[PDB]
Amino acid sequence: LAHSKMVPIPAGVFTMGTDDPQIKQDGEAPARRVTIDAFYMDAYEVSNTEFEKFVNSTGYLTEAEKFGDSFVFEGMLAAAPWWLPVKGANWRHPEGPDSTILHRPDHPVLHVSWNDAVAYCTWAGKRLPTEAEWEYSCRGGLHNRLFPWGNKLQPKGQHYANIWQGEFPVTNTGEDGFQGTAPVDAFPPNGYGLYNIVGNAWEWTSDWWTVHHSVEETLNPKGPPSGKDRVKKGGSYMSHRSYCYRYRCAARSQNTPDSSASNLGFRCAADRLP
Amino acid sequence: LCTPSR
Ligand SMILES: *[C@@H]1O[C@H](CO)[C@@H](O[C@@H]2O[C@H](CO)[C@@H](O)[C@H](O)[C@H]2NC(C)=O)[C@H](O)[C@H]1NC(C)=O
Ligand SMILES: [Ca+2]
Ligand SMILES: [Ca+2]
Ligand SMILES: [Cl-]
């Protein structure tokens, strides 16, 4: 296992966002041309095992452990009735105190806040990606497509990401092989070598959230200089066409930096190899 | 809404 391996993301120019926004309130539009310098991206979401190495090394207590609770999705025991703040839910106990990660060491780490993620990435000699870096990487060298692999959800009749099948939130059929999270190396890689960049766990980025974007061309943009929420990308194992259609590279959402939940993780990036 | 904030 090499679940902390990084891949080189080539220098290039790409179209960020879309002029055919599917969720207009999220500022998916306008499409804008963004130039990104070559850098490195984690191939995988950070796994439980990799996060445990960090905690073993530093003694780091995550914000959810300090707060004493975190949000858990009801269907596997708030912003929605299916989200409960569960006392004692955290990265080691993803559904609460009588859950464990012992049988899922290679699944993405969850209940990690933006601050937790920055701590991990920095410890590792890395950083969070910007939203623009994240999206460029997600798109995997294709232009103006819905998904890392193209415009069809199940190309060649194959599942390409871990999202929801069935009627959300009552019934997840597990058609794609995973009801909850999958191992960080599950499903095909995209054109750049990235796994689970859409679906599985949501992923934190470094940017403050705004929905107001210029059409101006930019170089290595960092997002707005201030805000209250940080940007997350990519959707999760819970995502579905009918409710949270955000397993698209252009999609975007946000949370306050001290937030944590059972569907939210991260991956790191770096300017050079650590 | 996909993840509630704390
Ligand atoms: C994090 O540290 C714990 C505690 O050292 C590791 O678990 C122990 O590892 C030793 C050495 O291999 C084993 O002999 C013990 O049986 C383990 N004890 C426990 C508490 O399980 C653990 O392997 C480390 N995790 C990572 C990801 O490196
Ligand atoms: Ca699934
Ligand atoms: Ca993901
Ligand atoms: Cl989701």
Instruction: Please give all residues whose beta carbon lies within 6 A of any atom in ligand 1, as ranges.
Output: A 49, 52-53, 56
Say if residues A40 and A270 touch (Cβ distance below 8 Å): yes
- What residues pack around ion ligand 3 (CB closer than 5 A)? A 196, 200-201, 234
- CA dist A206 and A257 (Å) reads 10
Token digits for A43? 């191939």
Give the number of the ligand closest to the Cα of residue A107: 3
B2 is in an annotated binding site: yes
Closest CA to A22 of A234, A255, A245, A185: A245
Q: Which residues lie closer than 8 Å to A2 by C-beta, 6 or more apart?
A: none
Provide the residue type at A180 as one letter: G
Residues A126/A131/A132/A136 CA torsion (nearest 10 deg): 80
Q: Which atom of ligand 1 is nearest to the CA of A49?
A: 27
Token digits for A139? 């798109």
C-alpha gyration radius of chain A:
17
Chain B's closest residue to A25, CA to CA, is B1
In eight-state DSSP terms, residue B3 is S
Q: How buried is residue A193: exposed, middle or buried, by Cβ count under 10 Å (0-12/13-18/19+)?
A: middle
Give the number of the ligand closest to the Cα of residue A196: 3
- CA dist A132 and A206 (Å) reads 10
Resolution of this entry, Å: 1.7
Q: Which residues lie closer than 8 Å to A93 by C-beta, 6 or more apart?
A: A99, A100, A101
- CA dist A121 and A25 (Å) reads 30
Chain B's closest residue to A203, CA to CA, is B3
Give the phi and the psi of residue A105 in degrees, each rounded to 5: -65, -30
Among 3.20.20.70, 3.80.30.20, 3.30.360.10, 3.90.1580.10, name the CATH number for the domain at A1-274. 3.90.1580.10
Q: What Å distances lie between residue A184 and A19, A221, A266, CA to CA?
A: 32, 28, 11
How would you classify the pairing of strands A32-36 and A218-219? parallel
Q: How many residues does chain A have?
A: 274
**Structure-token match 């499409």, residue found:** A31
Pocket test for ligand 1, best of A52, A91, A100, A107 (most atoms within 8 A of CB): A52
Domain ranges of chain A: 1-274
Token digits for A220? 């290595």
- CA dist A77 and A224 (Å) reads 38
Q: Which atom of ligand 1 is nearest to the CA of A105?
A: 27
Q: Where does residue A157 fall: left (phi above 0), alpha (psi -120 to 50 degrees), or beta otherwise?
A: left
Which residues in chain A are closer than 8 Å to B6, comparing Cβ atoms?
67, 71, 113, 255-256, 258-260
- CA dist A249 and A71 (Å) reads 25
Provide the residue type at A272 as one letter: R
Q: How was this structure determined?
A: X-ray
Closest CA to A248 of A145, A121, A155, A164: A145
3-state SS, chain A, equals CCCCCEEEECCEEEEECCCCCCCHHHCCCCCEEEEECCEEEECCCCEHHHHHHHHHHHCCCCHHHHHCEEEEEHHHCCCCCCEEEEECCECCEECECCCCCCCCCCCECCCCCHHHHHHHHHHCCCECCCHHHHHHHHHCCCCCCCECCECCCCHHHCCCCCCCCEECCCEECCCCCCCCCCCCCCCCCCCCCCCCCCCCCEEEEEEECCCCCCCCCEECCCCCCCCCCEEEECCCCCCECCCECCCCCCCCEEECCCCCECCEECCCEECCCC
